[PDB]
Design a binder for this molecule. Structure first.
Ligand SMILES: [Zn+2]
Ligand SMILES: [Zn+2]
Lengths: 143, 141
């Protein structure tokens, strides 16, 4: 999975050791249909891993979350589930020259929450494309 | 195609497709500014004798009620006219490939920010929301 590759990329980038246990936890998360609980992951991995406690599952999940790879979804007095995240993108596109500039924007939860309302979709991530005319082509057209 | 599509809009919004209308819409689609009625009058009047600044204005009103132009106001300046490009919002299912359109009332805040940070003059947007549709999500629990 490019997904597993890309998550490991990020771990290594941080100086996070890429241990058998981490590699496994993450691949399980990538392969997951719903977001699993720690207990789900632990039980899927225990056959292959020896030493492995439920504690180390949580400890590694905290490490993925600080690295931005997982979000812990809490349910008051329940077991969290852990969402292996796909990231959102925002691009502005020049209709004249075709240049793309990436920009950051702090989420679009409001939009995601309603689209989920109107469509029925369980939303994972979004790509926003903004069309227009870049500065350098503005000058030439003249604005 | 833009002119084509705007006409399609008029015909359906119930509007006669007079030469002068088609001429102004074509001018609108081909212009990179947001022009004033005098801009548009000066360009076209040479081909239309019965054309007045009024008629330009009156036709812009028509197009604005058809949703094809936005009238931009400022200080004590004469209005400027923006020929609209629709934005689009789609939810795409990662499991079965389905794509569903929905409506959202604009992303003003994002456009104005994008324009600041990238330097772009923004026209419109398309947002794609990836997820899993009702159908596929029931199938998996
Ligand atoms: Zn450009
Ligand atoms: Zn589906």
């Amino acid at each position: 999975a490019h997904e597993l590759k890309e998550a490991l990329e990020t771990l290594k980038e941080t100086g996070v050791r890429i241990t058998p246990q981490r590699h496994a936890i993450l691949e399980y998360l990538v392969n997951s249909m719903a977001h699993p609980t720690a207990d789900d992951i632990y039980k899927a991995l225990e056959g292959k891993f020896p030493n492995m406690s439920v504690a180390t599952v949580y400890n590694n999940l905290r490490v993925f979350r600080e690295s931005g790879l997982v979000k812990e979804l809490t349910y008051g007095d329940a077991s969290s589930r852990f969402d292996f995240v796909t990231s959102d993108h925002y691009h502005a596109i020049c209709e004249n020259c075709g240049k793309i500039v990436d920009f950051h924007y702090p989420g679009l939860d409001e939009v995601e929450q309603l689209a989920a309302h109107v469509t029925g979709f369980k939303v994972s991530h979004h790509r926003l494309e903004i069309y227009g005319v870049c500065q350098e082509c503005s000058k030439k057209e003249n604005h």
